[PDB]
Amino acid sequence: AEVTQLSNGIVVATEHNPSAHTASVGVVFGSGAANENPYNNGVSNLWKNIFLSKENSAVAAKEGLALSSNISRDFQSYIVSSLPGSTDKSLDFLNQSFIQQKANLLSSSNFEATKKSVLKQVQDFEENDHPNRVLEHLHSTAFQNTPLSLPTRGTLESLENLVVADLESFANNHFLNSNAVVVGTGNIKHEDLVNSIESKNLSLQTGTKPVLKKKAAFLGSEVRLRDDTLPKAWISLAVEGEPVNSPNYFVAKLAAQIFGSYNAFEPASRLQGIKLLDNIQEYQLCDNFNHFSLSYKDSGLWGFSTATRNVTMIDDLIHFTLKQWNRLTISVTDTEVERAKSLLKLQLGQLYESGNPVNDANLLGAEVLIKGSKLSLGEAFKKIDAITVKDVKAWAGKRLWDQDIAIAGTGQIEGLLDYMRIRSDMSMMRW
Amino acid sequence: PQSFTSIARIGDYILKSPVLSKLCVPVANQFINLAGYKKLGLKFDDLIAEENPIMQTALRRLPEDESYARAYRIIRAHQTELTHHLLPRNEWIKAQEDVPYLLPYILEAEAAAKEKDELDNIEVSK
Amino acid sequence: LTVSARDAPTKISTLAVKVHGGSRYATKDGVAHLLNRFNFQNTNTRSALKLVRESELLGGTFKSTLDREYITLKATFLKDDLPYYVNALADVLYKTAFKPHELTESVLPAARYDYAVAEQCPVKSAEDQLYAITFRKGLGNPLLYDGVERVSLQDIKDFADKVYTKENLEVSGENVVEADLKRFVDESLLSTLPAGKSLVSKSEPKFFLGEENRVRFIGDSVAAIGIPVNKASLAQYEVLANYLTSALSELSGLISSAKLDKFTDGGLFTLFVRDQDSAVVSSNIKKIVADLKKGKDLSPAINYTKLKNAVQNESVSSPIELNFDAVKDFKLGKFNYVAVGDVSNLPYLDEL
Amino acid sequence: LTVSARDAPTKISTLAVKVHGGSRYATKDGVAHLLNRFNFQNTNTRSALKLVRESELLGGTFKSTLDREYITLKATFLKDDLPYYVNALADVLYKTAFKPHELTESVLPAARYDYAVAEQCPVKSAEDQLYAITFRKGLGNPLLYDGVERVSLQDIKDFADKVYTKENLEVSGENVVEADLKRFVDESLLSTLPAGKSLVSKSEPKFFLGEENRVRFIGDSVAAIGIPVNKASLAQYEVLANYLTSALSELSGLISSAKLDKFTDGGLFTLFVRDQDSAVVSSNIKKIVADLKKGKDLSPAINYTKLKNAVQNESVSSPIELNFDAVKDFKLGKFNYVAVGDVSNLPYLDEL
Amino acid sequence: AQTHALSNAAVMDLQSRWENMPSTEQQDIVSKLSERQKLPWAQLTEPEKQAVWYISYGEWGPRRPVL
């Protein structure tokens, strides 16, 4: 359904959809925040926020274009939403504003204003957004002293060393033709986008990007960011999960869906088909949990992230969640797997084919940057339907059963016991 | 068990006298250096046993930055003595850093409790 | 009973039954919120637990949504099992149990959580105050239930009988074959629903201008203006909202939010300025009101708001199909003003 | 430093130091309430426990009352120990401790209790609303601290240094030998207080008319009208308040309360109609405003209001000595209106 | 010669992170430092001097000891 073609310097990937009323043209680079040091960290975030500058966005809004960017760990995108008949203007803006004439966004008193903006923004993140910085500290300890631990937001003390030379060095090292995929979603045809890229000479640069000397290695550890003036106690907890283009990728997503997510105040999330709720609903152990399967190019995390005000019964919540995790290795039933297949099919169908062509562009650029081709959703649903109970048990015995966990928590986590007592729950004594 | 007002009274008498100061102050300085609580990162007002309502009152009345710093020094001393080492020599509490920070709060709560007891046991002169 | 669908070669279908039964038609304050929370509870045949645990194996979820005007009962699912969800939405609309233990255990704790969530945000409180002082008893009803008037179970049942009627709702399915959808809406309970009148009034909703309200709030301080707009002047305030949101406007740093709410008979342009200290909010909204009373040229924002309205409009089921071509100039006339927060340091209406 | 006393042949004297330092003169919201709750705490010399446990054995108590204008420090005692209480009020005014552990342990919980109690009553909520929309930043300050703006300990010390000044207070002793009181107020710390300026302005408080506020409240429903009045028109609204409270009116069965708050530069006449269900409040206050806009003969209530004014006026130390003789007729003009409670069924200002 | 200074994001703590810097960033830092060398050596900042010294004589590569 989607067409990818490698033109003479650059990779053009389009996903046409003639039912849509917008069209997004962008370029996705394959250097997210895993291509940083711990000292220039946040320079991808500064590049995002100077692509979304006021001086730069006024030029788009006069033409009728919308600017959207996104910073992930592997990739980063710079996508320009427009109307379907106005995509030559999108390519002209993406060419002039961001690729060629790059030294006008990087003027002083635009760099200074944006640096103050993301300093305020990252500090506002670090003081107020507690589940997401707990996932960030989970990455920072699960992958410590390795590329995949650097926060995509950037720290407050590495964003204060940053000058214009650092953004220029990140640009000349990572914004390359062998590193980019120019992406078109919405209702633009594949011949149309590649013709408009062959028409105006669209070249980023010619180099090859710096190879990271160390691959991402999971180190079982914990960080314990306790703060007793906070009302809840947020805690993420995860094992090393499967990377992208693993064979056990969809099995990892399925096993994340076996225990699903939860909201204790939505009365239809109470009635779900998860056996963990029979434990955690009686004394109201938590307010919400959600099991994720984060997959990156090198490694990834499989775990669950939760929040609770029942700060004296954290150990029952952790114990019951992990004794439910052992059931994947030993006694996962069939209807749990069929329920997880139906719900993972619904989740993946809502995720990939939603209404927004920006999110489709980010997903398309990531999947054809890492794999070189985007897997369609029919083949993905065939792969999900191929998963049996023995596949889930074998993946759980490989990845979950008696393996090193990574924990992270802030708030009132005095009720959280130490590492060895929690890691003793990853394997039971066969009862 | 010994009231802090009494320790302040005897110590102020020793410090205000010129002979007792120059005789007993170096003995106390060498006593504090031999006591070795500074090698664990503790100031002395972390060492006072808090399990009494005067000390609970003073610790409730401590301002928050001193409370967080005292919490870190206590946890750091617990981890240091767990590992059966000391802190490195740049992490030792300096002499000018070892200020009595809990002492005005202890002495004020002590004076309040002594005045409350004295008014509990008065005899009106009639 | 107006059924529509828009087919597509994808895998996920979303059915949506939209009833004109939101807070605007609420007889008591918050009875629409209690019915919206009462929607996907147990029926007379299938329980609420059996609905979730059957539809999870079939592969779809449910979501009842309360608007200012609509109650939207939405079902998102795998495409090849449409009639289960048509019959499920039919059972929800036709035969709900309405048990007192269901009121006191799930619906009222859920509504208390919803009111607590909306109470902690001062912008939602300012928007509800702005609605209640622009429109008094029509669209300015309370959105959520708070309990300032006792809404009993028979009130929720009577509102269900008033609202779930056959000329009051409209079935719309994104990524649904329309022939099979129109066949499956019949031979169901939507054809057995009563044919009550449509509650949509086609007249102008009788606004009031020059009103001001002040709420003391512990937290952030917002000051908000609100302009009731008619049907003819909907497009100009649409391009004004996307103008002040956009980077074309010098007021974009000062404005926390600016949006036009749209209905079939009018609308409300809301502008919110939110900060932590009240001197910042005072200086900001004085500058907004002054530089808007001085006229603005909204001709730059036309091509931008076409795209923004298209992005917003592909999600909804009934587009209004605005013009945006005859909009040239704006000049702020009369407007309603609310001030939530540190309310002794925020400006009043005559100081703007 | 105005010392006055009215001697009597009885056993109990009361001393009252009245500062012009109530909520009207508050710089932030609620500093006056926090200073009032900080009044009889410990000093630099005598503790607060020693104060109570000495004054009980001597035979008198203390009480600090916060008004809309004053802060009254009252002290009630057996007659033959007046210099103790003069020196105790002197110590409280001159040297209070203002300790941070006293702010967190006593003053803030006592003020939170006062605010919770006055929050539970919708009549005091409506009275505060009626003040705050008649006059805005002067008398329409909040009476009590609620925490919508951060009042710190240093702000209470600043407000106390501003307010506790020698030309700002007045010493008044009911049943006190006045020459002895003047000898005991001198040779004390009242004479060593700073001779600052008096905060009493002699101008009119810049009122506003036709304003309307609406506060949602779970419980009873009150609707309140309120008229700011000037110095020439104080007696008429006095005889009006005692007319509508009295049994001469036909509206006394409908009116929950009606009182005139007098000040040295004006007043506010506040009429509250309170009931459980909002339809009774609506019918009652529509009848009140209609039969007040139609004129009333306030001539019969004149001898009755001389009695009730003498009753109310013997307690206070500062009589205003109104006329009550030229008052004949009343007709309701413009007025400010607040509605608290079931606020979607209490009427608005247009419907009155 | 060159521009103002090597940034602290690209030169500070060069001892801890020389052997993990990729060879391209090593070569680019070495090139910019060699361009900074021709300026009068008062104008070099202290992390620049530490980076130049560790690049030439640090205990990496050929100066790595036996054990």
Coordinates of N, CA and C in Angstrom, one line a residue, chain B residues 60-61 108 115-116 119-120 122 124, chain D residues 46-47 49-50 53 57 99 101 105:
Chain B
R60 N 10.4 19.0 64.4 CA 9.3 19.6 63.7 C 9.5 21.0 63.3
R61 N 10.2 21.8 64.2 CA 10.4 23.2 64.0 C 11.6 23.5 63.2
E108 N 14.9 26.4 72.9 CA 13.6 27.1 73.0 C 12.5 26.1 73.4
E115 N 8.9 26.0 81.5 CA 7.9 27.0 81.9 C 6.5 26.4 82.1
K116 N 6.2 25.4 81.2 CA 4.9 24.7 81.3 C 4.8 23.9 82.5
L119 N 4.5 26.2 85.6 CA 3.2 26.7 85.7 C 2.2 25.6 86.1
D120 N 2.5 24.4 85.7 CA 1.7 23.3 86.2 C 1.8 23.1 87.7
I122 N 2.5 25.5 90.2 CA 2.6 26.7 90.9 C 1.9 26.6 92.3
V124 N 0.0 29.7 94.4 CA -0.4 31.1 94.4 C -0.2 31.6 95.9
Chain D
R46 N 6.9 37.6 77.8 CA 6.0 36.7 78.4 C 5.4 35.8 77.3
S47 N 5.4 34.5 77.7 CA 4.9 33.5 76.7 C 3.3 33.6 76.6
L49 N 1.4 30.9 77.0 CA 1.0 30.0 78.0 C 1.0 30.7 79.4
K50 N 2.0 31.5 79.6 CA 2.1 32.3 80.8 C 1.1 33.4 80.9
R53 N -2.2 31.5 81.8 CA -2.2 30.9 83.1 C -1.9 31.9 84.2
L57 N -5.6 33.2 86.8 CA -5.5 33.3 88.3 C -5.8 34.7 88.8
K99 N 6.9 34.1 65.4 CA 7.7 32.9 65.1 C 7.2 32.1 64.0
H101 N 7.3 28.8 63.6 CA 6.7 27.7 64.2 C 5.4 28.0 64.8
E105 N 1.9 26.2 63.5 CA 1.2 25.4 64.4 C -0.1 25.9 65.0

